[PDB]
């Protein structure tokens, strides 16, 4: 059982980690999470713009 | 009665009465590119009759001291017909081939030709003779067109590899006492699903007389060799203006 | 103890090796995280954002570099002229260097997927016109006239209340991935050439200016990926920092 | 549908862990059944066996076919490079081309296409084989990345490039390298030109050069700012793992001359066989 | 002008085929982009009395500085490696 | 930590050792494989393919080496003459060096199994004849006459519409495997001698040539195996490549 | 759990592999698969040739 | 990696030690054994003669 | 630094210190140092009988 | 090489001494009037 002291408690994937110490920040990086939300940088508008409609009618 | 054969594709037909089997290279028939192997997203064109038909090239003359000939594919057809126009207007091409080599003589002639398909036939030079020059073959040698070129050192196939184990490739023989034709069906072989038709040659066809031609004086001394080829599942993609080379 | 043998690779330091190292502070616990807006999980979220393409990258523009962000469009006397021409290679030196997609491509070796270029017209309300924006697959140089350039992928853009159009550059390649194009053997990996032509004239009434400007923006599509992460060649360090 | 014409492999694999058994057979006299007469013109190999040509006994043999599998044929470390630091400013940039040594080159060129993972081992010493306490750095530079110009260049910061720090008195370093071609396999033979354009005689060097096999630059240095008084000799060895191979080729019977072309010495063509005097006397 | 990126795709601008592609998005994740050891400091003992006090500032080398300054905020654990030798690269028992 | 002891074999580099080494690229994924025809999984698939045997390996043939691939057959005056004679050793220097079986045998130390030699007649349709192709087990030299040579394994070949015959060389050995035969103590591993004789004459009418040629092809059977993979002796490197 | 990134996903045999890392190309070679299809190099003809029948009748 | 400590007896070669060493030939298979008369399993079979 | 190579019968044996046979592309070879522990390998039964 | 771009057949001499070239109906109109020098060369069939 470890001290739960890691920089990130998320996006490291379920399990897939290796540690030999009681501190959780000493562990390896593991394989990364492949979640992504691109629409908060590309379409951050209040009224949603449909692809086929004219965007300024 | 399997010595007779008929190959019909497009608006063309080849009949033969003195034949061996048909060789299907590596046990695979030509196919169109499936969705799992494709990478380019635009829709390809498949003309299906105007390009998938038999094409007859120029005719060689088998003499008593001939070394051998080679052709490059699909370089032989880049200026011929509707296939040659689709290969110039498009950037990518993909197709298989059906090669047919004809050579007839009488029952008093003798000789044997080896007809082989060698993929990625890269040519070498004699390196200036002494081995000190880093020479390279010219453009008329590496891509000779529909005419073809002559082999200079057929024992090493002009590439440093022996003729004696060329039969590890898909091949047939034309033995003059037995048959007068050879037929190989070649699929598309590359590391990529599509490629350029003007920059890359998939395979080379080699026709080499292993046993030389012989006859007595008074018989016909003009023994010609004709090559007839057909694309099978020709696809083209990447449409742009016509580029010849 | 337990019998062991040491293998090659012993006492080496590989900088990309992922392992377990000894912690310096036993029982330490960090500051708890709070919610911050704008978290990034993948670099492909940044690559889909449109940034300005520097199509007007001229040698006479280097002392007034704000003019490199827009290229002019004017009233023509002859028909079918070309306005601009540039390559579609995002990792090559040229107009794509000023984009965040062309900057994050430099940290990787190979790329794949479709691109997009958006052109925004910044003239008057009273100005009209039609342009032809073509993408040519590899095989040649810039097309000589308009009737040669329209044989490839193109879009005809009409100026109006919607001030923007999108030319999608589709993935048309022989290999599954493309390395970055370069003069030499690596011109095997070239993407092609984007040209813009006059379909009709730039028409204007009395009282409105006869020259306008177009801003080009570029991003990536949702089938875009990169691989083989490497060092970039844009930053350097000859002198010591501070 | 108003238009009716718009409506529209030979062999398989088997696991053979041992060689084939021989069945017992007796004599055979008759007409019509001739298994010894063949036709080599069809392009097919002969299908005649032991039991149809002679009288055989029963042999149950358990000779394994494991060693001739291409994974066992290729998983052996062979020399691919020798790099020397006498190149007098303490660094070498080596362009990666593994076709410079004839033993591994002839094994790989049996096939046309190959797809594998690799394992590289770096055996370093002095030019006479002695070892000294000396720190070195190996860096892999992918194509497009900046390559180092001196011993104290900024490119040795290796913030994204993979790098190995090692000592000469250490054991040899080992790394695993994946399959990193933009195509689906490496090809040792590429019949064509990489780019478009005219193909004149001054650009004939371009023939046969595939950019799908060009993997970049391997850089070495001595780490410190000052000049090291030791000469370096680095030998690189490569194992081939997880291999797939396509399209066998004739094996080369001529000695190699250059690294990028199949050029051969034309004044001395070697015969594949050893000659004798008469065809009747061995 | 809306501040939004373009939402036009391949299938709405040209005629496309079906492509089932399996290109992975694992390498561009920011864990794989950052988990590479880069140089942050060079400390020398020619400082002639046998000790150095170095104030920790990791923004002195341009390659790791430009990678980290792509973002405004960052929260991570670190792993530090100390490669020590003589100024010419030789090693002594010390 | 855990108590351990280091054993002999520590810090050695064995080139045939199979182990786990550290990867250089975390998160890398390769290009997906496509279907390519002609995949090889085992080297015994290549060994069963017939390739040309250089029975006519004479010292006068070295400047015209295309004549080494066929040996002549002609009209005889006396009866029972021999046409050719060669050893059945695939790994020895001689006619078997030009085959892909005799080349892949050189990468291994020991072999086992049956062989096959196919002779193809390349004369006229009007030519007739009968040949005796014999295989002799070890114990002697080339047989002096035809009545000595037929006491071993043989086949009588009649020329006709089928232009080929197969002489199977069966596995007749004392050991389970054979090393490669050589002058000295390793003549213990010899296979024997293949000779071809005239059974009747080569008969021909007026107007057809009196000399024809035979091509010999050689492969392996389905009980063929090899073992103890080693370096070949055919390629060398005295001068540096490039 | 590993990144599935190996040069060959076939002919390595069921299991029989050793790895200590999250990348699949770092693993050992293991023992090879003994599958073989010799008939696509030896008998690649359209009409199959029986052993006892005359092959050109 | 895993924390370990080296004990006395490290890097010694004891000639009667029985352990595992690295093989030189991957995938090698020997010649199959045949039946030979007169097999010995223990030296006490010879001592009773 | 030393190199031990096993040359099976039929394989080319080295003629000098810089011979091509030391490339060991198929021959099993061990690279070792003199200050190392002694090298150990396992050798199978490799007779033709 | 110009003539083989149309409909053709390759005939090998042998034990079957005959071959058939089929001339297929390739026309714009459903029926053809008889071809003649003048305006009625509109109805020509082609060249063997
Ligand atoms: C610190 C790690 C350094 C090791 C980097 C090694 C990466 C290079 C691996 C390349 C794998 C073989 C690619 C092709 C090699 C041949 O030179 C080409 N076929 C040339 O014909
Ligand atoms: C014996 C252990 C010695 C190692 C101690 C290392 C502790 C320091 C870790 C700091 C982590 C990065 C903190 C910020 C670094 C940059 O210099 C600041 N952003 C300055 O702008």
UniProtKB/TrEMBL annotation, chains A, G:
Q: Which residues form the signal peptide?
A: none
Which domain of life does this protein belong to?
Viruses
* Protein name per the record: VP4 protein
Q: Name one GO cellular component term.
A: viral capsid
Shown residues in whole-protein numbering: 13 to 69 of 69
Any one GO MF term held by the record is: structural molecule activity
From TrEMBL, chain B:
Where does the record place it? Host cytoplasmic vesicle membrane; Host nucleus; Virion
- This protein is called Genome polyprotein
Q: Which organism is it from?
A: Coxsackievirus A16
Per the record, the domain of life is: Viruses
Instruction: Name the coiled-coil region(s).
Output: none
Q: What does this protein do?
A: Capsid protein VP4: Lies on the inner surface of the capsid shell. After binding to the host receptor, the capsid undergoes conformational changes. Capsid protein VP4 is released, Capsid protein VP1 N-terminus is externalized, and together, they shape a pore in the host membrane through which the viral genome is translocated into the host cell cytoplasm. Protein 2B: Plays an essential role in the virus replication cycle by acting as a viroporin. Creates a pore in the host reticulum endoplasmic and as a consequence releases Ca2+ in the cytoplasm of infected cell. In turn, high levels of cytoplasmic calcium may trigger membrane trafficking and transport of viral ER-associated proteins to viroplasms, sites of viral genome replication.
| Oligomer and partners | Interacts with capsid protein VP0 and capsid protein VP1 to form heterotrimeric protomers. Five protomers subsequently associate to form pentamers which serve as building blocks for the capsid. Interacts with capsid protein VP4 in the mature capsid. Interacts with protein 2C; this interaction may be important for virion morphogenesis. Interacts with RNA-directed RNA polymerase.
Q: Which segment of the chain is annotated as a signal peptide?
A: none
Automatic annotation (TrEMBL), chain E:
Oligomer and partners: Interacts with capsid protein VP1 and capsid protein VP3 to form heterotrimeric protomers.
Annotated family: Belongs to the picornaviruses polyprotein family.
- Species: Coxsackievirus A16
Complete-protein stretch covered: 616 to 714 of 862
Region forming the signal peptide: none
Subcellular location(s) of the protein: Host cytoplasm; Virion
Q: Say what the protein does.
A: Lies on the inner surface of the capsid shell. After binding to the host receptor, the capsid undergoes conformational changes. Capsid protein VP4 is released, Capsid protein VP1 N-terminus is externalized, and together, they shape a pore in the host membrane through which the viral genome is translocated into the host cell cytoplasm. Component of immature procapsids, which is cleaved into capsid proteins VP4 and VP2 after maturation. Allows the capsid to remain inactive before the maturation step.
User: Which taxonomic lineage does the organism of this UniProt entry have?
Assistant: Viruses, Riboviria, Orthornavirae, Pisuviricota, Pisoniviricetes
Q: What is this protein called?
A: Genome polyprotein
UniProtKB/TrEMBL annotation, chain H:
Q: Where in the cell is it found?
A: Host cytoplasmic vesicle membrane; Host nucleus; Virion
Q: Which domain of life is it from?
A: Viruses
State the function annotated in the UniProt record: Localizes the viral replication complex to the surface of membranous vesicles. It inhibits host cell endoplasmic reticulum-to-Golgi apparatus transport and causes the disassembly of the Golgi complex, possibly through GBF1 interaction. This would result in depletion of MHC, trail receptors and IFN receptors at the host cell surface. Plays an essential role in viral RNA replication by recruiting ACBD3 and PI4KB at the viral replication sites, thereby allowing the formation of the rearranged membranous structures where viral replication takes place. Capsid protein VP0: Component of immature procapsids, which is cleaved into capsid proteins VP4 and VP2 after maturation. Allows the capsid to remain inactive before the maturation step.
Which family does this protein fall into? Belongs to the picornaviruses polyprotein family.
Cite the record's note on assembly.
Capsid protein VP1: Interacts with capsid protein VP0, and capsid protein VP3 to form heterotrimeric protomers. Five protomers subsequently associate to form pentamers which serve as building blocks for the capsid. Interacts with capsid protein VP2, capsid protein VP3 and capsid protein VP4 following cleavage of capsid protein VP0.
- Tell me the protein's name: Genome polyprotein
Source species of the chain = Coxsackievirus A16
């Amino acid at each position: 059982h470890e001290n739960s002291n890691s920089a990130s408690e998320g996006s490291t994937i379920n399990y897939t980690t290796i540690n030999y110490y009681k501190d959780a920040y000493a562990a390896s990086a593991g394989r990364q999470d492949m979640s992504q939300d691109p629409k908060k940088f590309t379409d951050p508008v209040m009224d949603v713009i449909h692809e086929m409609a004219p965007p300024l009618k | 009665s399997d010595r007779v054969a008929q190959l019909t594709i497009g608006n063309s037909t080849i009949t033969t009465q003195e034949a061996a089997n048909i060789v299907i290279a590596y046990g695979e028939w030509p196919e169109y590119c499936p969705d799992t192997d494709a990478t380019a997203v635009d829709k390809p064109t498949r003309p299906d009759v105007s390009v998938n038909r038999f094409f007859t090239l120029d005719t060689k003359s088998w003499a008593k001291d001939s070394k051998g000939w080679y052709w490059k594919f699909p370089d032989v057809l880049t200026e011929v017909g509707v296939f040659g126009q689709n290969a110039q207007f498009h950037y990518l091409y993909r197709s298989g081939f059906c090669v047919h080599v004809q050579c007839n003589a009488s029952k008093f002639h003798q000789g044997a030709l080896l007809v082989a398909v060698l993929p990625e036939y890269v040519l070498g030079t004699i390196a200036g003779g002494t081995g000190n020059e880093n020479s390279h073959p010219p453009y008329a040698t590496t891509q000779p067109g529909q005419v073809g070129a002559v082999l200079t050192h057929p024992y090493v196939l002009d590439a440093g590899i022996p003729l004696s184990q060329l039969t590890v490739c898909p091949h047939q023989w034309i033995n003059l006492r037995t048959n007068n034709c050879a037929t190989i069906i070649v699929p598309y072989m590359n590391t990529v699903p599509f490629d350029s038709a003007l920059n890359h040659c998939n395979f080379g066809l080699l026709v080499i007389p292993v046993v030389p031609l012989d006859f007595n004086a008074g018989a016909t001394s003009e023994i010609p060799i004709t090559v007839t080829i057909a694309p099978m599942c020709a696809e083209f993609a990447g449409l742009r203006q016509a580029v010849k080379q | 103890g337990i019998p062991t043998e040491l293998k090659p690779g012993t006492n080496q330091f590989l900088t990309t090796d992922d392992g377990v190292s000894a912690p310096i502070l036993p029982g330490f616990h960090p500051t708890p995280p709070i919610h911050i807006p704008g978290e990034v999980h993948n670099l492909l979220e940044i690559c889909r954002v449109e940034t300005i393409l520097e199509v007007n990258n001229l040698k006479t523009n280097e002392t007034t570099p704000m003019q490199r962000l827009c290229f002019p469009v004017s009233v023509q006397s002859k028909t079918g002229e070309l306005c601009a021409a540039f390559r579609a290679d995002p990792g090559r030196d040229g107009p794509w260097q000023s984009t965040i997609l062309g900057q994050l491509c430099r940290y990787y070796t190979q790329w794949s997927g479709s691109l997009e270029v958006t052109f925004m017209f910044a003239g008057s309300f009273m100005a009209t016109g039609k342009m032809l924006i073509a993408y040519t697959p590899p095989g040649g140089n810039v097309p000589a006239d308009r009737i040669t350039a329209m044989l490839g992928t193109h879009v005809i853009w009409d100026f109006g209340l919607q001030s923007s159009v999108t030319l999608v550059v589709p993935w048309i390649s022989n290999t599954h991935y493309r390395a970055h194009a370069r003069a030499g053997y690596f011109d095997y990996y070239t993407t092609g050439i984007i040209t813009i032509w006059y379909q009709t004239n730039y028409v204007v009434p009395i009282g409105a200016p006869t020259t306008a400007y177009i801003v080009a923006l570029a991003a990536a599509q949702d089938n875009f990926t990169m691989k083989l992460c490497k060092d970039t060649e844009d930053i350097e360090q000859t002198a010591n920092i501070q | 549908d108003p238009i009716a014409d718009m409506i529209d492999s030979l062999t398989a694999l088997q696991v053979l862990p041992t060689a084939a058994n021989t069945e017992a057979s007796s004599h055979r006299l008759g007409t019509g059944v001739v298994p010894a007469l063949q036709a080599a013109e069809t392009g097919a190999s002969s299908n005649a066996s032991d039991k149809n040509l002679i009288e055989t006994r029963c042999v149950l043999n358990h000779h394994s076919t494991q060693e001739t599998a291409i994974g066992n044929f290729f998983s052996r470390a062979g020399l691919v490079s020798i790099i020397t630091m006498p190149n007098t400013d303490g660094y070498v940039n080596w362009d990666i081309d593994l076709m410079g040594y004839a033993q591994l080159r002839r094994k790989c060129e049996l096939f046309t296409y190959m797809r594998f993972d690799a394992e590289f081992t770096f055996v370093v010493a002095k030019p006479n084989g002695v070892l000294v306490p000396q720190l070195l750095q190996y860096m892999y530079v992918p194509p497009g990345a900046p390559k180092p110009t001196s011993r104290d260049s900024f490119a040795w910061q290796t913030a994204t490039n993979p790098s190995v720090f090692v000592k000469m008195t250490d054991p040899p370093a080992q790394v695993s390298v994946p399959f990193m071609s933009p195509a689906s396999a490496y090809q040792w033979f590429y019949d064509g030109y990489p780019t478009f354009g005219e193909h004149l005689q001054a650009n004939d060097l371009d023939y046969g050069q595939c950019p799908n096999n060009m993997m970049g630059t391997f850089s070495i240095r001595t780490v410190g700012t000052e000049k090291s008084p030791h000469s370096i000799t680095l030998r690189v060895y490569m194992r081939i793992k997880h291999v797939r191979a396509w399209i066998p080729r004739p094996l080369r019977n001529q000695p190699y001359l250059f690294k990028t072309n199949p050029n051969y010495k034309g004044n001395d063509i070697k015969c594949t066989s050893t000659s004798r005097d008469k065809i009747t006397t061995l």
